[PDB]
Amino acid sequence: QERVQRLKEECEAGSRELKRCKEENYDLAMRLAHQSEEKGAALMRNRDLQLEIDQLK
Amino acid sequence: QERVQRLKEECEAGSRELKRCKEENYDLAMRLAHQSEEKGAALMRNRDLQLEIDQLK
Ligand SMILES: CNC(=O)[C@@H](C1CCCCC1)n1c(-c2cn(Cc3ccccc3)nc2-c2ccccc2)nc2cc(Cl)c(C(=O)O)cc21
């Protein structure tokens, strides 16, 4: 009777929330990849800086 | 009656997947915060290393 209606409305609301949750997940994964690249770059800029310091010792 | 239980079961399975999705999102946010702190730590170390280079010029 009415239980089909609330259930379909609940499934629509949950499905909508699941779609935006997966979009957030994709964005967080992309942001995590960007920070790993930026971290990797900063560490290697310090490997270069360190090696150059060691030679002028 | 058959449709009602099918809708009860797909909303329950979808809700379970949404809870699992939010837990993934929390883990990606924690990892993103970790990499951002490690990047900041490398940029700060870079400043002090650059100072050391400037003194041996
Ligand atoms: C065929 N059904 C599905 O694919 C289900 C999922 C399959 C079984 C495990 C979890 C659900 N689904 C649905 C979905 C499909 N109803 C059936 C339905 C019935 C009437 C109206 C609207 C939806 N229910 C849901 C639902 C319900 C509650 C919370 C989250 C999702 N929306 C999705 C959005 C997304 Cl973003 C995704 C995804 O990318 O994986 C999947 C979703």
Tab-separated table of C-alpha atoms and ligand atoms in Angstrom:
chain	number	residue	atom	x	y	z
A	1	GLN	CA	0.000	0.000	0.000
A	2	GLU	CA	1.803	3.219	1.277
A	3	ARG	CA	4.958	1.266	2.292
A	4	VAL	CA	5.951	1.072	-1.416
A	5	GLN	CA	5.826	4.917	-1.588
A	6	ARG	CA	8.046	5.598	1.525
A	7	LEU	CA	10.469	2.886	0.445
A	8	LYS	CA	10.823	4.331	-3.088
A	9	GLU	CA	11.276	7.848	-1.643
A	10	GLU	CA	13.959	6.482	0.783
A	11	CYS	CA	15.760	4.652	-2.079
A	12	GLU	CA	15.724	7.871	-4.168
A	13	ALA	CA	17.179	9.928	-1.270
A	14	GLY	CA	19.816	7.338	-0.466
A	15	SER	CA	20.764	6.883	-4.143
A	16	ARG	CA	21.165	10.667	-4.492
A	17	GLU	CA	23.400	10.738	-1.402
A	18	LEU	CA	25.420	7.781	-2.689
A	19	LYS	CA	26.027	9.549	-6.046
A	20	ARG	CA	27.413	12.723	-4.364
A	21	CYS	CA	29.407	10.530	-1.913
A	22	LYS	CA	31.147	8.790	-4.824
A	23	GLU	CA	31.854	12.182	-6.482
A	24	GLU	CA	33.458	13.375	-3.195
A	25	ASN	CA	35.489	10.123	-3.068
A	26	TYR	CA	36.832	10.706	-6.590
A	27	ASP	CA	37.775	14.330	-5.717
A	28	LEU	CA	39.494	13.238	-2.462
A	29	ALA	CA	41.500	10.619	-4.394
A	30	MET	CA	42.594	13.239	-6.929
A	31	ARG	CA	43.551	15.687	-4.147
A	32	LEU	CA	45.524	12.891	-2.399
A	33	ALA	CA	47.434	12.206	-5.695
A	34	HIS	CA	48.206	15.941	-6.059
A	35	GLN	CA	49.559	16.193	-2.483
A	36	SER	CA	51.724	13.084	-3.050
A	37	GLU	CA	53.239	14.735	-6.169
A	38	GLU	CA	53.852	18.010	-4.270
A	39	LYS	CA	55.420	16.091	-1.347
A	40	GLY	CA	57.607	14.036	-3.718
A	41	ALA	CA	58.800	17.246	-5.432
A	42	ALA	CA	59.619	19.016	-2.127
A	43	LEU	CA	61.604	16.010	-0.851
A	44	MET	CA	63.695	15.782	-4.016
A	45	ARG	CA	64.329	19.597	-3.948
A	46	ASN	CA	65.804	18.804	-0.432
A	47	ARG	CA	67.867	15.856	-1.718
A	48	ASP	CA	69.380	18.321	-4.265
A	49	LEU	CA	69.890	20.976	-1.589
A	50	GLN	CA	71.462	18.512	0.807
A	51	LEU	CA	73.906	17.015	-1.764
A	52	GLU	CA	75.043	20.538	-2.755
A	53	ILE	CA	75.634	21.417	0.960
A	54	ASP	CA	77.635	18.195	1.528
A	55	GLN	CA	80.031	19.128	-1.306
A	56	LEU	CA	80.755	22.580	0.192
A	57	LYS	CA	81.750	21.066	3.603
B	1	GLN	CA	4.199	-7.917	-0.800
B	2	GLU	CA	6.979	-9.209	-3.105
B	3	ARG	CA	7.778	-5.657	-4.334
B	4	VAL	CA	7.745	-4.303	-0.751
B	5	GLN	CA	10.420	-6.719	0.506
B	6	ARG	CA	12.553	-6.129	-2.663
B	7	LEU	CA	12.424	-2.350	-1.970
B	8	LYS	CA	13.160	-2.896	1.761
B	9	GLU	CA	16.219	-5.024	0.736
B	10	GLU	CA	17.532	-2.560	-1.925
B	11	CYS	CA	17.258	0.423	0.410
B	12	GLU	CA	19.043	-1.634	3.157
B	13	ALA	CA	21.811	-2.683	0.706
B	14	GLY	CA	22.154	0.878	-0.644
B	15	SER	CA	22.307	2.381	2.870
B	16	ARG	CA	25.031	-0.143	3.779
B	17	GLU	CA	27.004	0.864	0.674
B	18	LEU	CA	26.625	4.567	1.554
B	19	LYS	CA	27.986	3.913	5.099
B	20	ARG	CA	30.965	2.030	3.522
B	21	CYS	CA	31.496	4.945	1.072
B	22	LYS	CA	31.641	7.541	3.869
B	23	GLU	CA	34.227	5.406	5.741
B	24	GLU	CA	36.415	5.358	2.547
B	25	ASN	CA	36.003	9.125	2.285
B	26	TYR	CA	37.110	9.606	5.934
B	27	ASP	CA	40.247	7.486	5.262
B	28	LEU	CA	41.075	9.467	2.086
B	29	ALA	CA	40.625	12.760	4.060
B	30	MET	CA	42.995	11.503	6.788
B	31	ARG	CA	45.572	10.467	4.183
B	32	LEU	CA	45.220	13.813	2.386
B	33	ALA	CA	45.740	15.677	5.707
B	34	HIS	CA	48.826	13.517	6.390
B	35	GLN	CA	50.425	14.247	3.005
B	36	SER	CA	49.685	17.979	3.386
B	37	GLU	CA	51.472	18.008	6.771
B	38	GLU	CA	54.463	16.095	5.337
B	39	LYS	CA	54.611	18.544	2.401
B	40	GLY	CA	54.531	21.532	4.801
B	41	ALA	CA	57.273	19.847	6.875
B	42	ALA	CA	59.441	19.488	3.721
B	43	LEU	CA	58.860	23.128	2.658
B	44	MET	CA	59.893	24.317	6.146
B	45	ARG	CA	63.006	22.097	6.104
B	46	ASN	CA	63.777	23.585	2.625
B	47	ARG	CA	63.848	27.084	4.112
B	48	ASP	CA	66.537	26.142	6.676
B	49	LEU	CA	68.547	24.196	4.044
B	50	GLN	CA	68.464	27.226	1.673
B	51	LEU	CA	69.766	29.388	4.585
B	52	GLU	CA	72.739	27.032	5.008
B	53	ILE	CA	73.507	27.322	1.239
B	54	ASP	CA	73.335	31.158	1.384
B	55	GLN	CA	76.005	31.200	4.146
B	56	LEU	CA	78.440	29.075	2.059
B	57	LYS	CA	78.233	31.488	-0.933
C	1	LIG	C1	20.971	-1.054	-9.539
C	1	LIG	N1	21.204	-0.447	-8.241
C	1	LIG	C2	22.358	0.127	-7.927
C	1	LIG	O1	23.286	0.273	-8.726
C	1	LIG	C3	22.456	0.631	-6.482
C	1	LIG	C4	23.564	-0.016	-5.650
C	1	LIG	C5	23.717	-1.524	-5.940
C	1	LIG	C6	23.629	-2.398	-4.690
C	1	LIG	C7	24.579	-1.915	-3.603
C	1	LIG	C8	24.339	-0.434	-3.246
C	1	LIG	C9	23.321	0.249	-4.158
C	1	LIG	N2	22.543	2.109	-6.462
C	1	LIG	C10	21.527	2.980	-6.197
C	1	LIG	C11	20.201	2.579	-5.721
C	1	LIG	C12	19.245	2.056	-6.564
C	1	LIG	N3	18.186	1.742	-5.796
C	1	LIG	C13	16.856	1.298	-6.228
C	1	LIG	C14	15.879	2.446	-6.358
C	1	LIG	C15	14.512	2.208	-6.356
C	1	LIG	C16	13.613	3.245	-6.534
C	1	LIG	C17	14.067	4.534	-6.708
C	1	LIG	C18	15.424	4.789	-6.696
C	1	LIG	C19	16.324	3.752	-6.524
C	1	LIG	N4	18.389	1.999	-4.482
C	1	LIG	C20	19.604	2.537	-4.428
C	1	LIG	C21	20.095	3.074	-3.138
C	1	LIG	C22	19.263	3.090	-2.015
C	1	LIG	C23	19.703	3.646	-0.823
C	1	LIG	C24	20.975	4.187	-0.735
C	1	LIG	C25	21.810	4.168	-1.841
C	1	LIG	C26	21.375	3.617	-3.034
C	1	LIG	N5	21.889	4.242	-6.284
C	1	LIG	C27	23.241	4.201	-6.603
C	1	LIG	C28	24.142	5.241	-6.787
C	1	LIG	C29	25.450	4.933	-7.105
C	1	LIG	CL1	26.555	6.261	-7.233
C	1	LIG	C30	25.881	3.612	-7.265
C	1	LIG	C31	27.272	3.192	-7.598
C	1	LIG	O2	27.930	4.002	-8.386
C	1	LIG	O3	27.733	2.132	-7.187
C	1	LIG	C32	24.976	2.566	-7.076
C	1	LIG	C33	23.673	2.887	-6.730
